[PDB]
Amino acid sequence: QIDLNVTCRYAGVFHVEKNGRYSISRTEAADLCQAFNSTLPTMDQMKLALSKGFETCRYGFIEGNVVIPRIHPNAICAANHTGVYILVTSNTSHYDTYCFNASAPPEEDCTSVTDLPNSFDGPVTITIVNRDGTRYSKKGEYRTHQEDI
Ligand SMILES: CC(=O)N[C@@H]1[C@@H](O[C@@H]2O[C@H](C(=O)O)[C@@H](O[C@@H]3O[C@H](CO)[C@@H](O)[C@H](O[C@@H]4O[C@H](C(=O)O)[C@@H](O[C@@H]5O[C@H](CO)[C@@H](O)[C@H](O[C@@H]6O[C@H](C(=O)O)[C@@H](O[C@@H]7O[C@H](CO)[C@@H](O)[C@H](O)[C@H]7NC(C)=O)[C@H](O)[C@H]6O)[C@H]5NC(C)=O)[C@H](O)[C@H]4O)[C@H]3NC(C)=O)[C@H](O)[C@H]2O)[C@H](O)[C@@H](CO)O[C@H]1O
Questions:
Q1: Residue owning the nearest CA to atom 11 of ligand 1
Q2: Residue 45: left (phi > 0), alpha (psi -120 to 50), or beta?
């Protein structure tokens, strides 16, 4: 079983956390976004999302970097920084991910995610968990690198 907690989309950008813990490698992140018919966001896509209301208190991959979007300063979320905070120094390699779906609405979309449209055949029960608790499950796989499995 894999549980994927997903946020609202902001100009197509959303956050995904796997199994309630920082647990996604950079290769898994890319695979996960693809399974959502999405891509790792660019910095510019993130910046537009943050301008529309997107913030989290989680490190996650984008294309090229690990970031936290911050609107309000909070001392335990990117050490009180605002903006798209870029992680500079870390020993470790596993984070959450962000994803970008170009077909999402242009502003804030807090409707539930109901589908992992490009997951492939496989043995895993994958459950999408929305913040309101609504869940969607399917049997499949999305990880293409053996080292991530
Ligand atoms: C120093 C040093 O060594 N080097 C410097 C470096 O320091 C490092 O910085 C890191 C950093 O990023 O800051 C540090 O990492 C953090 O360490 C902490 C201690 O170990 C960790 O706790 C923290 O983990 C994160 O904790 C968060 C937390 O809040 O505990 C977690 O986020 C929460 O997740 C919850 C579940 O998803 C969310 O529900 C919650 O959101 C809040 O939820 C509220 C609620 O629902 O109750 C909600 O309140 C409601 O809001 C509505 C509408 O707004 C109101 O109307 C309603 O009434 C409210 N209800 C009420 C009143 O109850 C809130 O709005 C909402 O925020 C999440 N919390 C937040 C804040 O969003 C998160 O999941 C954990 O990951 C670590 N942080 C991270 C990011 O991992 C590290 O320890 C440091 O070493 C510096 O960063 C660097 C700077 O350059 O410099 C180095 O030198």
A1: 78
A2: alpha
Domain ranges of the chain: 1-149
By the 8 A CB rule, do 3 and 127 touch? Answer: yes
Which residues 6+ apart lie within 8 Å of 103 measured at CB?
12, 37
Structure's resolution in angstroms: 1.2
Return binding residues for hyaluronan: 21, 58-59, 85
Phi, psi of 115 (to 5 degrees): -150, 145
Q: Whose alpha carbon is nearest atom 23 of ligand 1?
A: 76
Cα(145) to ligand 1 centroid in Å equals: 31
Task: Name the nearest CA neighbour of 136 among 17, 18, 6.
Answer: 6
